[PDB]
Design a binder for this molecule. Structure first.
Ligand SMILES: Cc1cc(C(=O)O[C@@H]2C[C@H]3CC[C@]2(C)C3(C)C)ccc1N
Lengths: 11, 224
């Protein structure tokens, strides 16, 4: 889990 | 046999599966770099990175994935990365050696034979199903959209995304292997072998952690 994954999903 | 809606679903999947590129810059390193345990490990680090990169890109475009609870999305991504990745590396391994140089690097990169051997058995076990792209894509999607992963809150929303994929695969099996009615079951049987890599992979990571360094993305995807 975390920020980098959330970023990659959202972009 | 596919319904209009099944076709539509299959095309979205295929559109997204095909945008997945292993970059040339990386395939180039497989020949162009010197061989040592260190160089080989760097190359593999970079390949693993790209595999997970590509997994995220594929995942985010799966129908319904964007409607899922944001924590469940993350649980699925972490839950499936090993299996999704091993599956993709099979596809890349079987479709020039080339393959040969890659094999050589893998076999000299601080990985014990205990893990190398099953990895390569698996590549062979996959290769004699002679799977089409459609089959690889759908399987990958089925692996990713598994309701059985740790930490999922709403397992039903995942199962509803997965089931249709399984229907589409079952029919495709009947269209491309009409003489082998056990094919669908064989594909699903290879998934149980695929799962054994969850345990192998954790062990490979544990022995690599002897001063070795990982990219940010691999650190997040596997909590290390
Ligand atoms: C954290 C980390 C993980 C891997 C990995 O498991 O992926 C490898 C690349 C391919 C060759 C062996 C792998 C397990 C593969 C089949 C995905 C490789 C390097 C690294 N630094």
């Amino acid at each position: 889990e975390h920020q980098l994954l959330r970023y990659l999903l959202d972009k | 046999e596919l319904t209009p809606d099944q076709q539509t679903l299959l095309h979205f999947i295929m559109d997204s599966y095909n945008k997945q590129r292993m970059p040339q810059e990386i395939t180039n390193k497989i020949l162009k770099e010197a061989f040592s345990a260190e160089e080989n490990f760097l190359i593999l680090t970079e390949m693993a990175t790209n595999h997970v990169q590509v997994l995220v890109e594929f995942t985010k475009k799966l129908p319904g994935f964007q409607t899922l609870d944001h924590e469940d999305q993350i649980a699925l991504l972490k839950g499936s990365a090993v299996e999704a990745m091993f599956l993709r590396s099979a596809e890349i391994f079987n479709k020039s050696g080339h393959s040969d140089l890659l094999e050589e690097r893998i076999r000299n990169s601080g990985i014990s034979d205990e893990y190398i051997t099953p990895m390569f058995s698996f590549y062979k076990s996959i290769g004699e199903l002679k799977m089409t792209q459609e089959e690889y894509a759908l399987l990958t999607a089925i692996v990713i959209l598994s309701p059985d992963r740790q930490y999922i809150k709403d397992r039903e929303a995942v199962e509803k995304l997965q089931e249709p994929l399984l229907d589409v695969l079952q029919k495709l099996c009947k269209i491309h292997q009409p003489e082998n009615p056990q094919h669908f079951a064989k594909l699903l049987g290879r998934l149980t072998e695929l799962r054994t890599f969850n345990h192998h992979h954790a062990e490979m990571l544990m022995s690599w952690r002897v001063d070795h360094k990982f990219t940010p993305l691999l650190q997040e995807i596997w909590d290390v």
